[PDB]
Amino acid sequence: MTSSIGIPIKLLNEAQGHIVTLELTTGQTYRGKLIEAEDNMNVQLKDITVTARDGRVSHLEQIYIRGSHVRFFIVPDMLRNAPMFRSRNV
Amino acid sequence: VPYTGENLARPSYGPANPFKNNVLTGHAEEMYISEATFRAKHRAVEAVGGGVMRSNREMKEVNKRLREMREDKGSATIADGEGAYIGPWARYKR
Amino acid sequence: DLKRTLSKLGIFLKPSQYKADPKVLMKLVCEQFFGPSTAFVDMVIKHIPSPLEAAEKKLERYYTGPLDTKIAESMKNCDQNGPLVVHVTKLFNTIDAKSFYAFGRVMSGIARPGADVRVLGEGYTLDDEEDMVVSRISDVFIAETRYNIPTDGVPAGNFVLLGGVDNSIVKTATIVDKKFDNGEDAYVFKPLSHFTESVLKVAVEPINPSELPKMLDGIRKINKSYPLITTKVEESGEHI
Amino acid sequence: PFDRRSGRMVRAQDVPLIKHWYLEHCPPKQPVKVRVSYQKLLKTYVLNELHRKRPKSMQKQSLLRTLKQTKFFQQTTIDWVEAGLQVCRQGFNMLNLLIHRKNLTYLHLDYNFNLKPVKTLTTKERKKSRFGNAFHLMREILRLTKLIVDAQVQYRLGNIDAFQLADGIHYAFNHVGQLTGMYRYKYKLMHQIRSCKDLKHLIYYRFNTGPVGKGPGCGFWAPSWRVWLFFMRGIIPLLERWLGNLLSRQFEGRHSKGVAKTVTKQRV
Amino acid sequence: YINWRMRVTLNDGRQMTGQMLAFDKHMNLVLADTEEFRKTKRMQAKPNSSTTQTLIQEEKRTLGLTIVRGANIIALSVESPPPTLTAGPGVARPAGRGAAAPI
Amino acid sequence: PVYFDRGFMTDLMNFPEQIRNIALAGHLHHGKTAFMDMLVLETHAIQERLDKRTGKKRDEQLRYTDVHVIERDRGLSIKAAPMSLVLSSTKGKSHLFNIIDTPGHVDFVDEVAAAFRLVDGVCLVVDVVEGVQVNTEQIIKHAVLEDIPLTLIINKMDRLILELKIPPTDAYFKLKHVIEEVNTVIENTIPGRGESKRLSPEKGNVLFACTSMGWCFTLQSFAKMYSESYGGVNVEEFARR
Amino acid sequence: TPRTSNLKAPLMELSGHTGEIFTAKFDPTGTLIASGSMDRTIMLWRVYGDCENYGVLNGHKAAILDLQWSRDGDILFSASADMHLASWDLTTGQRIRRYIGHEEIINAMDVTQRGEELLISGSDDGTIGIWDPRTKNAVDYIETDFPITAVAVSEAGNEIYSGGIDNDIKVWDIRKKAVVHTMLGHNDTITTLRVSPDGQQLLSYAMDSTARTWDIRPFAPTDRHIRTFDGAPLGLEKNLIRGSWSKDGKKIAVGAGDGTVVIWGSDTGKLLYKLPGHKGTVNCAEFAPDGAPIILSASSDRTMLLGELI
Amino acid sequence: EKRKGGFVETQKADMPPEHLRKIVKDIGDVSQKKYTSDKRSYLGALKFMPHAVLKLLENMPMPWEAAREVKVLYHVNGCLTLVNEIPRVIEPVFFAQWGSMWRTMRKEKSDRRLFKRMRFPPFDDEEPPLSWSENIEDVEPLEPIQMELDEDEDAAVYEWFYDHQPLIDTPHVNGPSYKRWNLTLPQMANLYRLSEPLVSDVVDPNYFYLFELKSFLTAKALNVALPGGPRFEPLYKDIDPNDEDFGEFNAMDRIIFRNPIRTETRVAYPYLYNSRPRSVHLSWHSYPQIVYTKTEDPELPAFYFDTSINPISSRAVAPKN
Amino acid sequence: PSKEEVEATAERTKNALAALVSGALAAQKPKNVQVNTKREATFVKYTPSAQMGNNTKKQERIIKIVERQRDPMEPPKFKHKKIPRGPPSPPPPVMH
RNA sequence: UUGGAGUAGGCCAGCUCAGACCGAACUCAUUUCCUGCCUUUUACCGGAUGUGACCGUGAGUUGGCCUGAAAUACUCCCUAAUCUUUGGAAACUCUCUGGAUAUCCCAGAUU
């Protein structure tokens, strides 16, 4: 069998380069520019605004986030209007 | 308005003339019956034995008596000589 | 046998396509093998700069104005919220060839329809402002050669096709906003530096001397449409 | 089409076999008649492409399919030689029936479609029997058809072999102007005759090189046969109209005046 | 079931609401025009009543498009359904009705 | 009809970092309009109309960006021709490409100059058979003197396989000869720093293509094919080797 | 002679079928018309505006013997002598599906409009098919032993009035699949069966040229027959003539083989109209459902007449 | 459904050929008084005789066929027999068949001692027409012109090459209506080789530079003749230099004269080299040069470094810096 | 007259003249083969009048009329004739 | 992985469209002009200009014919080794913060 990739995973791949806001299993919300996302949803970010559930607001650069420990992501409406949502019949 | 039941019910007054066909021999009107209707009524008049309470089994015996009134069709595996096929060109013996 | 080989590779076609002509079959098998132009897209993304990266180079290479200004900063950062600057260098004539859509690059701002602009010629300076015409951008297209997509606005770092700013442009123009909000002046981009010479010389006159003004208008349109063409009137009254 | 592996089937007359011979440059060292032939064939090709049309044959009914819809026409499969014998017999009987209805039985139509008087004609008879262009063009076309069908009949009887058959067909389609008077009733048929002569020059010169001598034996008849099929294509609407009007006069009479005469030069 | 409106309940007890777009074999949920619900049971102790009414405040916030991690979805509730005539041969004309039609 | 969304294209216009402005430039008839045809047929739904063509016009090349009547009659480009396409990378991310297709005749280098003024990078299309020709040299000189970044597209690999009919080792040598000829013109224009602007397939700025058959690859993308087939290869190291 | 409708003319003629028009029905809003005819087609018209044939539905292999609309006018159902029913989406003009299972000509069909939608069909194999308009397979079928030519659904939605060769209007209960009771009195085969808009009475027209109104409310005497309207002779074609009630229910119309649509008063019994206009038998006569005085008559003339009752 | 017009409808069938044969034999020459009621139609069908001539002559057999059967549409009088066929052919197969005829005919003309041309007309003027049934019907036909094909070399077309409609029962055609074909590579190669006397050698489209339709039309509009091309009546007989007398441009003292511009250049660049270029056509400028050469040695593989190809040297590549 | 009366007149006259134009066209171009595929039947209702000599009523008659299949090869049957034109319509009073 | 909707091939006939390439092919007529040849016409020369016809073609659609096949099948729509569904769980104390505030309780966070 030939391995296909999931639509949310390739949506992360199309979301690379934009200002994504995600949050993680310790209840932590991170904002910034995504620079690489892989099929196991491991991501990096570069201009991170940090809001941790203990009330910790901070800002730093170049973080690595595990896809097992992430909870969800937020991406813009143009990435809603991306071409892969047009189901090309083959 | 001219086709109201009252207007159609009222008749023309006056005594009759003491003294309207478009054909010289009658009245002809263009009509739109069905082809099956015409063919069935024409058949009812045209076939012999019109009406007649008569079932499919006795259809089969009437056809049997007619089919041995007809002559012998032949075998259709003998090309020449006696016994050859004549089929639908068999004479009704009279 | 072909079905066997391509099924080994994982390439599948309809059997009619299998019995198709060799050239169409070859194109179909190449589509199933190589796929689309993702290799070209990767190469260009990796080895060619963004407008956000090449704006500074193109400013220091082709801007006559001072580089330490806020309009220079807006063009350097490709800000779509800044003043409108479009560097028009090509003119594509319309379908009936009655006018010349001005094709250029939006450097800063957003080029949007019904917008009052100043079209600046190749010889516009602060003291000598004869090569400046106030006009209005009337139509804005994304050009697709075979067709045009009319839009409500083309942002910075992009290519725009402008209708309405046509007449004053001869070879190259800089279309700037009417008045910048910082109280700062406008400067033009440098002319094109072509890399061959127009050395072949042809004289024209009309067959109808009454129709000679039509030759003048057509020669103007020719001079607009062809960048390296140069038209003169030699003093014997002969058009060159 | 040899770069293809699939296609649609085309008409046998729509395959030109030597069109690229005259479409490419002429080979070196050719006679002047051959060079002129190459140029005339190019001229016909360029004029065809220049006057290329684009009609709308939509209201088109097929004649043979309408006739097939009727009860008076039936369908069967026969040999081509049988069909040709029938067509030649039918054409002969038609022209003979027309002659006899017009009471011109002092004219004899023979089986090769020659029309001759059987005696010396008076002036009155010569006038009543001066046939016209529609009759005579149809008679010469049936004469050519007879010549072709008769060549096939000779081959099928066994009097000639197949090489002689092909050579005779090629001779006939190249010598229409000598074997008929079809040009005498339609003078643009000289365009068709000239086309066949140009093809004869090209084919002959490329065919009789080296060990192949000069004389009869060339049976490469498809180009000339093509030419006469396309001539027929153009001549059908014209002759079917003309023959229909011949039959209108024969069967309901001539309307003499009534449609007004124009003011010609002699009437000004 | 694609392009219906969905409410998804997540393992700590959250709710993510709105229009869903796609899925995968891992049932990762992408969903658009989202607003989020937190069921925070707040102890709004009134100064006049001694009964501490633990009111489940369902606070909401709009975010946009979600990409929910597939190892986190608990519950999915469906809410609402998603949001060539060639002209014929016929002519129509005024006409009369007839002469008399006697009974 | 297109296979993307034009509103999405306008939003890609709004974000100015994922945009590339490129010009396709090269010698006469080396395949620039044909490369644009490849991209147009990937993005646009016009294959059914091209299939409904019959005869010699069914054999005709599309040439989407040639629209002038001189272009359709003479068969060469004389005007520059811009298009804006939403193309996809190997990772699947849509980008915006503003591409200007330039002429290749040595007379319309004014069109080439105007396009080079507008664009940020130049993809140079070079026929693998003829190699570096006169307008290839002219365009190389102008591009590197204006300091425009340069990538290379070696075209007509079907002419390698089907016309010349040379074995694959000699095909490698032919490709190496063409790439080194391009780099030789680079070096002879800027001595001492052509190595800083070196074009070679192992770096990934050389693309092998056949535009009549609609395919292209880099070594990195071909190693990515090997990665997707056999699983678990290190793609950059494989392409380098 | 006043103007009593928003038509282009007090009477208009719609032509374009190339065969006998066997059925013609109004929209539930009374602005569209679907006509099914023996050229195996359905033609879709707009009555207002001016008039426009806006649709043609093809796909049936034989004559369109009956049709009906949905509750809101987006799905059209039709029974045809190809032994099939069919449902058609009218926004795309395309056949949703076919309902298969009848073994002879499907003479009549009706659609249950209230509660939840159903299809009822009466056919010459002696069957009454109960069809759900989502499955091609029949939910149920009542099995008689005589051909059935007219069917109607009670407003309650679970009784079916069916008449056929046996000259008796048999009222059946669906859930029992069994005959409740037989209204008797007709002498020839019932051609139409229609309930009044208020729902307490049943018009039936048979081939003995008598249009009888019957009672439907459960409290009624042993003889349930209200009245026997006359004035519409069956001609020489044994067609299934389809009458109707007025929207207010005071008028009652059938077609008649002398080309005449005949209208009586359902309460009184007097012949209100005997409108002419057709040269074949008038197979269908339909009052407008929006309360307008518009009458529609469809005949075996390959045309129909749409007039106003001034 | 079987009576959707009032009656049971069936397809029109073919009759026996003996039926048509009996009809024409009975009517003969239309001489017996029985056939007067046919005489008006017979003579009336004369109007349609041109179609019958075209249909027969286009469905005529090819030199490799001894006999051909054709469908005919005949009148029940015996007045008009119309060949109801179109001679539809696979164009590669038809090329190969006539190329094989070219070669076979040339061999026979070199090998025959004396070629006796057959007489025209083949029959006498007063000789009555022959009969199918008594002169042709069952007569043994002679051998048609056919190439001796090769059981091994021409194996790919061996069984079917000279059939009337080749491959009509095989999956290489759409069906008996003979409208679409598909052939294999061995079959196509064998047909190309058999059609070798009549195939164009031209591979480069640059061969027809200034010798193609647009150039011919431009030369016609310019009233000039290309070398080897056709010549026409002028498009514009209006311009003479004496009419274009000494106004401004015709000054021989003003024009610099180099070596002269030719007619081919005037046609190749019609808007630069002509003052009034009306109705001229812009021809295709160039094509990329074809570097394909046909291999003569048949033992050579598909991919090989040909001797005609200039060699690639390591120091010809030479990465310098 | 008003626009509605002018358009009613134009429709009536366009119909009559169009029928004559079709007649003239079919006369000017005979339609190659003079058979029709659309050879459907007309039905006529036929109520008869009495008889020559009988006044007894007799049965109503349905007539199926079809156009006859004529042989497409046939020329027209009858030779045309020259007849002098008939007298005019009765001349009107001379109102001088 | 499925339910929903589908049913073959060949051939014949009709209808509707299609050229900018219906047609990798090629004829005829004719309008208005120009040239030529010509005692008048027809039959002609060869250029322009439009306008018809004829020999053909494709796609869609509808009906029929021929040979099969027959709950078979195909056709579409749609679908336990770490890194994710084969787990560090489950339970609840202690401490801290907030509400209540004398506590109980509860929330958040931590071990």
Ligand SMILES: Nc1nc2c(ncn2[C@@H]2O[C@H](COP(=O)(O)OP(=O)(O)OP(=O)(O)O)[C@@H](O)[C@H]2O)c(=O)[nH]1
């Ligand atoms: N063998 C081969 N020929 C090709 C290929 N691509 C294009 N061609 C041919 O090359 C010729 C010229 O290509 P064009 O499409 O005109 O490309 P171009 O470089 O834009 O030409 P110009 O605009 O004049 O510079 C065309 O006739 C194509 O058929 C290819 O990939 N392989």
Ligand SMILES: [Mg+2]
């Ligand atoms: Mg190009």
